[PDB]
Subunit: 313 residues, 4 copies
Amino acid sequence: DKLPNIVILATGGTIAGSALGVDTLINAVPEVKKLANVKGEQFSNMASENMTGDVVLKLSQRVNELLARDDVDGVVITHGTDTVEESAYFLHLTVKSDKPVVFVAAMRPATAISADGPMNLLEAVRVAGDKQSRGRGVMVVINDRIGSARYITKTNASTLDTFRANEEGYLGVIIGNRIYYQNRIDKLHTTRSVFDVRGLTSLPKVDILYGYQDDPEYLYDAAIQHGVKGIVYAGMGAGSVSVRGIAGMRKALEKGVVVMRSTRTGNGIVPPDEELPGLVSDSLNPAHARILLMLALTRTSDPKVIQEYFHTY
Amino acid sequence: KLPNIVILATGGTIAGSAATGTQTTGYKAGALGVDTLINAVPEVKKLANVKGEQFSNMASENMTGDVVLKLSQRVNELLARDDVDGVVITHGTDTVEESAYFLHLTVKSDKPVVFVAAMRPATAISADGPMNLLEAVRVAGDKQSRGRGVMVVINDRIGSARYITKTNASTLDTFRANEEGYLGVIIGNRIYYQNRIDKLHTTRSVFDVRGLTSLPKVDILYGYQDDPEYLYDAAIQHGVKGIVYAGMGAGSVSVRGIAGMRKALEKGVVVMRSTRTGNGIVPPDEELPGLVSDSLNPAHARILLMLALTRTSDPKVIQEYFHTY
Amino acid sequence: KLPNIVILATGGTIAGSALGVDTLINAVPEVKKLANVKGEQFSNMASENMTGDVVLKLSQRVNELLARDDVDGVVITHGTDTVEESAYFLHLTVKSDKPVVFVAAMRPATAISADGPMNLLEAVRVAGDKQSRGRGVMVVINDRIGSARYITKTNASTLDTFRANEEGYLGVIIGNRIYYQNRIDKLHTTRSVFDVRGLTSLPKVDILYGYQDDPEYLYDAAIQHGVKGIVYAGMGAGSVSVRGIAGMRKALEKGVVVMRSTRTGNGIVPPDEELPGLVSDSLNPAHARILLMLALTRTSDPKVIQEYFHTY
Amino acid sequence: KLPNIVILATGGTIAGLGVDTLINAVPEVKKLANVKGEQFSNMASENMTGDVVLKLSQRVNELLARDDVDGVVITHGTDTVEESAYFLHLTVKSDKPVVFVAAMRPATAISADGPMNLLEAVRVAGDKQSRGRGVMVVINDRIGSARYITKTNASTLDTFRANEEGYLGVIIGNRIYYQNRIDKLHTTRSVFDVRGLTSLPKVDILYGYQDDPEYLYDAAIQHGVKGIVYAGMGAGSVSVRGIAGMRKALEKGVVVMRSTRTGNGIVPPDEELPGLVSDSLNPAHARILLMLALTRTSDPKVIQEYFHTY
């Protein structure tokens, strides 16, 4: 081991060029050879909008397996952009290793002009292989930037630069074939996390309900009746709740559903409010809130413990 | 001369101190709220001849389409009058973008309509509301403000109602339009106009609602991993005319979402694919069901879809409204 | 009929490899479906070495091209470092409503995931579109359409460097389609008064930085070398130290125009009658300088120049 | 009981001796801390100087050694707080909270920010999770690291930002939410001690633009500058005129530091270009470090390593 050993797990199609697909990827971008000893694995093949808790769970298990081996220094997972933040945050909380776990994606198809995936892959591999990258949590790498799974989110439908943490910034950047680490997230993750799900084959059902003018109560009932253990509320402003939403939350709590108030806004803190039902999501966005609420619910259903989870994770 | 500005209030005051030390409150017994407001910021009197009017009294999270409808119609009456040069509207920050965009589409006047709000309680140390109102009144009263569409004014910034959004739950600077910027900024008691929106609005808008008392039900459904079909069902069952998909990425749809959407379409519901991301273009994609939302975020998409649905059920017409408004 | 678009190259190509402009056109052959393009190698330098004299000629050429009825628009390949300067110059001096689209690339043409190919394609689409007319000069990169008056390189090294934080993008290009969002509320192009077609050189204008312990000797240097104007990349909102105030006042005595701008990157420098010189409005140093050069060709009267800075 | 926080003032009040006016104007601070006002100086940040910042550093170190000071809040003008704050970032030998604070609106102005800015700043200094995080600038509900934070906008409340690096934390609902820890050396881990020094090396900043003059480099040389920070075009790019000027300076043993006028991001190494590169330090920050750098060494390599690690 002189060049590091990197396993590129593919969860979908290639993001570079045009076998399994993970072989097309590595063929298309031969320069990763010079960065690391790479071995492909086509873990799954789906588009990220179809990625599912059950599979992310299998991916968390696979990645833990890989990072236990001594002949693997880090893992690069190719993933679609749409839910990479959800997958990433899941493995952020559940991977019991300091070894680097780098999600990578592309905002343009590999056949498109000026495709971003090739250089995205190169940056991702370089981040996984470099030994300064240990203990930073799960990372998302794209467009010269390194996001923390817990903070990074896809902020823009269709642009290369979509991945941003406006308030938290990037862990680091890759410019001129070199890595600049700027931040260490000040949250628990990976080896310091309490969430181990190597036992499980299934996760609690958690659904996200939006906040808006005239938001209907009936979507709360529906969700209760299909037996969710958690509702995340992508709420108006700072998790503000209409009379209708309060009513729906009253009825969820009575059935022992955990209600987690987040924000549709895009950024920032949802502060405690005891005049308002349910928990609050700190600075976790809806998609991240659900991921943590699910994992919370596999270990407890005590409001106070889960709340503290949201403040520390 | 000073212009004539009505200040419609929709909730509690955004300006006014309480009592600590030896000072006494600006919250008098039985005081209306918009009077509390105007008495708390007598510097507005220098900018305009203002007249308070308590239109409603709720937190913006409880603002309802049906109330917004009356607000639009109330504003139209005012702006038709000669004795009214512009209108400022105090509103909670949470859904001001929703209310603002409604009137952006439905006010048949070039006269400035400025929403104003506050992220800090009036009684807070360093409350933003005072200066927010001053700016808001200045923008409504200036002649250069005519024909710009409905504006949202807060933290020294003038946001178009079509683009502006609350991007942070808690901060003073929450209202941004990352890709579209601000129409203008207020700095040193001077207005600096930077942009005119290149979309239809107000007096060039077809969404007349002057004789309406009701609006089509539109609901919004989130896109996420393991997103349930049954939520589409639930919306359909409750008779929604439209569904706005707060979509994954560029309105990407899971197998479950596609199932739910093609069900909604069969029963005559218009599906509108937007994004949860917070920004950017959801492009056309004839591989996927429903229409797409251009750069309209879910909250805005709902408003335009509601108003389009008052005029048509024709997807091709609705889509074009979403590219032009 | 496709639109006819002349492509002026000011430097090396930004797409493909082997005139650089032919290498460019060939390397992205999809542009031929969008417009009929002729290439033309105006110059060949890195944007860093782009000079006022050369930019004047670029403006004059673009006016020649757009005077012709057989040209619907122009695309100008330019380096990222000073495109905002070149572009703002033409923004003010091109007497046409026809599209003028600066384009650039943050990665070399031969890099992995080079942005240049797609930037160019978008640039031509914008240049070729009829909704694009009368919007002023544009900078098109990373799916964005930036107004030359607002857009700036906000980052040393990133693809997404060109932003206008406060005033946003004129529009965006997503899925082979232009989405127009804003028209700049400022005078430009055919409503500009700046017509430099009779000129062969431009007044000398320098930019001095504001910072703790900033020296007056830099003002002296500027004055002694005959600058007609000085732009001040001021601390905050054009704030001036005692040393700055001395050097400005000395400059003003000598009849140099002083324009107080900001090093912050964004925002309004407002009027302050207690401080010397003029204020840049929301013009960043680099834009401020362009407009001061041109203003100096017509007037040396501070009142008139102040109005320019508020309306251009 | 409460922690003991000294408020040093470098100018007039930002709420309501300025520093007594300030504390009387914000009596809610005394429920957060035990506050001793102290009027260090009285100037607009525009006039703050290296020799004064050097004294402010020394003074702050004095206070932080005392057992009856848990941390220090420093009122300062917005225009150059980033320079002052980053100087102390590097030269304060203590883990105790050093929080700069400021206001974009004057104290008399409607909806002034100084009161809540100060309150927040005191809360950040009084909190015990605030230790060991570097010098901090607190304003508009945000805690920014001196090394990254900058005044991005001439005239706005929200001007203080670090687009790429983000905020160390935020204060929302009277509670501090720490987000990141800066992954750079600072305070107690810094090598820069200036408690001995009386004055500082001369470092000036020249802008990069079209038609930039060589003669300003000449002038800088002839007025005896020890370093020149280049606020360069794009990524430290240099015109032919800038190169010649930079070469002359390097001949004379002046350390040339290539930064960016762009306002954010990395200037990368480039052995074909003269001088050092500023990493992600903007011109204002780069000058500060180059100053302190030149008090220990004038070896390019060592200084370059400073720039990558501080």
